[PDB]
Design a protein around this ligand. Sequence first.
Ligand SMILES: CCCCCCCCCCCCCCCC(=O)SCCNC(=O)CCNC(=O)[C@H](O)C(C)(C)COP(=O)(O)OP(=O)(O)OC[C@H]1O[C@@H](n2cnc3c(N)ncnc32)[C@H](O)[C@@H]1OP(=O)(O)O
Length: 91
Amino acid sequence: LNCGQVDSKMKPCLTYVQGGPGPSGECCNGVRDLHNQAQSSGDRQTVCNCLKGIARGIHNLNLNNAASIPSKCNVNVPYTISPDIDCSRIY
Ligand SMILES: CCCCCCCCCCCCCCCC(=O)SCCNC(=O)CCNC(=O)[C@H](O)C(C)(C)COP(=O)(O)OP(=O)(O)OC[C@H]1O[C@@H](n2cnc3c(N)ncnc32)[C@H](O)[C@@H]1OP(=O)(O)O
């Protein structure tokens, strides 16, 4: 009960970076949302670890696309933006 939202809100964005059925629309809002939504108990810092764990092995991390999520999805948060994302460099 912590890394559920994770997906509920960014499924289309992780799909996007590993090469699946995203980011279309649901990602940008899911994203803008998450930036502003994952501010309950620090969620994105929890998310980080969830990301890290799948990332761990994943499919085709197109980090360029990932680092392009924010620019593409008007969510302007510095959010670390990296393969094995560290929770300590998020905002
Ligand atoms: C504000 C963000 C935007 C910043 C600016 C843009 C730049 C962003 C740059 C980084 C890009 C990537 C960002 C990712 C953000 C996310 O948080 S998306 C998370 C990573 N995505 C995935 O892992 C997608 C692939 N999905 C799975 O591996 C699996 O389907 C998941 C883990 C999503 C779970 O599936 P569900 O089946 O939907 O889970 P369920 O609804 O039953 O229940 C949730 C609960 O169960 C755990 N669970 C279930 N099944 C799994 C599997 N197979 N593996 C792991 N965990 C599983 C979930 O962890 C969750 O745990 P709770 O603690 O919430 O109970």
